[PDB]
Design a protein around this ligand. Structure first.
Ligand code: SAH
Ligand code: SAH
Ligand code: ZN
Length: 842
């Protein structure tokens, strides 16, 4: 007896205990999304099974390094071989599985690398001749209540991978039951010849003793097996049987081509930049060899120390949300060791097929037209350092350094160099999302060149027709409605999968055309920004090595990296361009992306001049977020130009017609939907609204360290005064907002920062600010009669409120409301003895 002591404890165990025990303290991956998307026909990004994740756990620790020809016996739907398709050093993948009634048939998928992946069904790998291969995977092994049975099957598959192994071969072989001495004897033999060791995957459920014979591992067999046997036993009795959740594998998209992938850098530009990082180390520096990067250019690494609080005031006043998981889990921070590297390899380590010649012309003329149209009633310019320092409204405190005078001599050095045509301190530092931090000095230069776009309001709706820059949420809704009035098809709000990684080099050269309309000292500077630091970036990213974390530095030309405040401009620009070119395609201006006939290149030019402005007004565009009401619904199939520019829509098959909204109130825009609210006096309001959990959860989270109690309480007061001015139409949030203000000293000025208009920051009475923004100043309201009690401002309907997230009618919330006064005093008592107003209605 051994781990068989485990198996009878398990076989002798009820149905529900079994399911409880199965997923206890194990690691799981959220498959709800992929499983729903694969039914809807989405044939890329998604993994086809839990298997991809499982295998990724081995690969990212180098326990298997798949490479070359990859045979995959018992490939099932394809989880392992698809995953292997996108891996760097892999050149071919063949998957063989039985298939047939009772077994899994493979799933076809446009997953990254799929072109190198041949899955065959109707194949008994026990009956087929071996083939040359450089890495061999196998995942066969039927479990059974009976341990002797499984050793049988386990030994069968062990006797099979041996025919396929050579001695240099890489492998990952499931050992269904490694605790029987039948298997413990053969595995020792096998380990003597071919090496490796058994390794347990934490994503395996507790109901199977699977261990994987993986090539690049080492260790003693019997002990490794017994370690797992007691770990699985311990877990029968485990208190706290919740399961930890990983996000699933993002398996990419599109085909793989040895020639086309891989950056050829122009080290005559990124150069003076890298060897500077080198010198700042040169000791710990080393050119790693197993670097993961496959679409970026590697250069070297160096040591680096590996690298959100709850707001008690808000939290104490939102007690019914202490058990909603979509609220309390936003405060948790998911610091897996490979978690950053995973987002990089799946989402940023991607390439985009260069557009066709005809796409490129369409873009170049539309951009050429647009930049001119944007600059009719506007003129570029540099932006002062004093102008820059002025944003002392949010060394080691960009403020403190904004005057260390030294600073401006350092910014002064490289700035001449940009004028000569080089940089040295213009590197990005990377940190589901990525943010490309940059040196506080470098962000000056780019502000001094391109600051004018975000500072003279070039994408203001009034100046660029499609923009919504500088429009509060109390206007975007009326603006969408204004578009719905336009006569045409349905409203389309397609999102792009990972927009910034989809910026092409052509995209960047097109946007650089704003330097046409510049000239002088200025132009040369805004030429360096574009050419030197936008089209030719160098980046630092951390990465975990078996020698401890290192900071690789890599470089890539493609994609959008820049100041999150400057990229907004260009993203709107190019998206405006892209949505125009799509509108064309639907209307029929041009008919092929490969060539633009001279007589079509004219139609494009005409249309642009004859209706271009009108087409722009059919669009609400904020960066990659867009809303389009075109002439007819032929827009919903005009996908050739969209796809070829790289702006691949998110969450449907590449050539699936887009779905249009026939009710603007459901059109998602700027992370909100907008309801149409009618007062008791019958004036109509268009109000912003979103899942109320993302609102509560946001408000209960604090930025940074050192928040005192007076700050923590003024941050909550910001969130509350914002709720009552924007989300006043939701019961919970207006109650919670009133509670917060009754519990924070009424004389304290809210100061902090909510999101990214901010009328809720005044210390005025909120009802006054309400009347200003919603009545005496929105244009969509001609009757300027003031409302003089909160009992005049309306709510959504009950059913809408609880649909958009409310808790009204749940007993816990009802209890929260009867006692809100007890809660306000808990917090007031905590704050101390100050002057409090009482906003709660009776
Ligand atoms: N004799 C045989 N020949 C080929 N495939 C077999 C087989 N016996 C079982 N299999 C198949 O092997 C698969 C292993 S489970 C496959 C999961 C896979 N690793 C993934 O990532 O998706 C099962 O679908 C089973 O049908
Ligand atoms: N953060 C961590 N904490 C504890 N163990 C870790 C770890 N990260 C990795 N490991 C373990 O360290 C191992 C590195 S695998 C090393 C394989 C090696 N390249 C060879 O050729 O033999 C993984 O198996 C994992 O089990
Ligand atoms: Zn709503």
């Amino acid at each position: 007896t051994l781990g068989e002591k485990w198996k009878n404890r398990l076989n002798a165990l009820g149905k529900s205990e079994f399911q409880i025990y199965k997923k206890s303290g194990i690691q799981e991956v959220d498959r709800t999304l992929a499983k729903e998307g694969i039914k809807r026909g989405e044939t890329d990004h998604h993994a086809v099974s839990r298997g991809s994740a499982k295998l990724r756990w081995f690969v990212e620790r180098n326990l298997v390094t798949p490479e070359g020809k990859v045979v995959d016996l018992g490939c099932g739907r394809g989880g392992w071989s698809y995953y292997c398709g996108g891996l760097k050093n892999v050149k071919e993948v063949k998957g063989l599985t039985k298939g047939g009634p009772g077994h899994e048939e493979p799933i076809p998928m446009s997953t990254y690398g799929w072109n190198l992946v041949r899955l065959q069904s109707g194949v008994d790998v026990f009956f087929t001749p071996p083939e040359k291969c450089d890495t061999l995977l196998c995942d066969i092994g039927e479990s059974s209540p009976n341990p002797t049975v499984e050793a049988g099957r386990t030994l069968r598959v062990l006797n099979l991978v041996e025919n396929w192994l050579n001695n240099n071969t890489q492998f990952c072989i499931k050992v269904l039951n490694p605790y029987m001495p039948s298997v413990i004897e053969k595995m020792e033999a096998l380990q003597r010849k071919y090496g490796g060791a058994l390794v347990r995957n934490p994503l395996s459920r507790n109901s199977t003793h699977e261990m994987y014979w993986v090539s690049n591992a080492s260790g003693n067999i019997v002990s490794s097996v017994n370690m797992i046997s007691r770990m699985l036993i311990n877990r029968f009795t485990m208190r706290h049987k919740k399961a930890t959740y990983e996000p699933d594998v993002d398996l990419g998209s599109g085909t793989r081509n040895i020639g086309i992938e891989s950056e050829t850098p122009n080290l005559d530009i990124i150069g003076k930049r890298i060897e500077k990082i080198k010198q700042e180390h040169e000791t710990s520096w080393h050119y790693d060899q197993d670097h993961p990067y496959k679409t970026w250019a590697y250069h070297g690494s160096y040591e680096t120390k590996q690298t959100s609080m709850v707001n008690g005031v808000v939290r104490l006043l939102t007690k019914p949300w202490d058990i909603i998981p979509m609220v309390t889990q936003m405060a948790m921070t998911d610091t897996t060791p490979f978690g950053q590297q995973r987002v990089f390899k799946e989402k940023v380590d991607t390439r985009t097929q260069e557009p066709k010649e005809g796409t490129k012309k369409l873009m170049k003329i539309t951009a050429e037209w647009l930049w001119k149209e944007l600059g009719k009633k506007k003129t570029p310019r540099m932006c002062t350092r004093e102008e820059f320092t002025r944003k002392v409204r949010s060394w080691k405190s960009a403020r403190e350094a904004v005057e260390d005078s030294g600073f401006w001599e350092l910014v002064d050095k490289e700035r001449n160099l940009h004028l000569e045509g080089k940089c040295e301190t213009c590197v990005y530092n990377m940190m589901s999302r990525a943010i490309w931090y940059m040196w506080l000095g470098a962000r000056f230069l780019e502000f001094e060149a391109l600051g004018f776009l975000n500072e003279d309001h070039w994408f203001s709706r009034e100046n660029s027709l499609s923009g919504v820059e500088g429009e509060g949420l109390h206007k975007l809704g009326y603006i969408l409605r204004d578009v719905s009035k336009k006569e045409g098809g349905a409203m389309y709000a397609d999102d792009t999968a990972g927009w910034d990684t989809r910026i092409t080099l052509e995209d960047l050269k097109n946007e650089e055309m704003v330097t046409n309309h510049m000239e002088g000292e200025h132009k040369k500077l805004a030429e360096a920004i574009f050419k030197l630091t936008y089209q030719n970036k160098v980046v630092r990213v951390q990465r975990p090595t078996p020698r401890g974390t290192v900071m690789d530095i890599i470089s890539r030309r493609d994609q959008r990296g820049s100041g999150q405040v400057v990229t907004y401009g260009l993203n709107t620009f190019t998206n405006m361009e892209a949505q125009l070119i799509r509108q064309m395609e639907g209307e029929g201006v041009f008919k092929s992306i490969q060539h633009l006939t001279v007589t079509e290149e004219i139609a494009v030019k005409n249309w642009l001049v004859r209706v271009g402005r009108e087409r722009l007004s059919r669009m609400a565009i904020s960066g990659d977020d867009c809303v389009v009401k075109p002439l007819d619904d032929r827009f919903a199939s005009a996908l050739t130009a969209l796809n070829d520019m790289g702006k691949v829509r998110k969450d449907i098959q590449q050539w699936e017609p887009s779905r249009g909204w026939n009710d603007w109130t459901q059109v998602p825009f700027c992370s909100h939907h907008f309801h149409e609210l009618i007062m008791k006096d019958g004036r109509v309001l268009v109000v912003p609204c979103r899942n109320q959990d993302e609102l509560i959860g946001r408000a209960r989270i604090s930025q940074g360290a050192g928040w005192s109690l007076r700050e923590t309480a003024c941050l909550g007061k910001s969130y509350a005064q914002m709720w009552s001015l924007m989300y006043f139409h939701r019961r919970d949030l207006r109650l919670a907002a009133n509670a917060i203000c009754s519990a924070v000293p009424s004389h304290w000025v809210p100061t902090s920062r909510t999101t990214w208009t901010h009328e809720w920051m005044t210390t005025e009475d909120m009802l006054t600010v309400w009347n200003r923004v919603w009545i005496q100043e929105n244009p969509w309201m001609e009757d300027k009669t003031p409302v003089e009690s909160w009992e005049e401002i309306p709510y959504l309907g009950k059913r809408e409120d609880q649909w958009c997230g409310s808790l009204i009618g749940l007993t816990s919330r009802a209890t929260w409301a009867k006692n809100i006064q007890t809660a306000i005093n808990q917090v007031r008592s905590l704050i101390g003895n100050e002057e409090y107003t009482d906003y709660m209605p009776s």
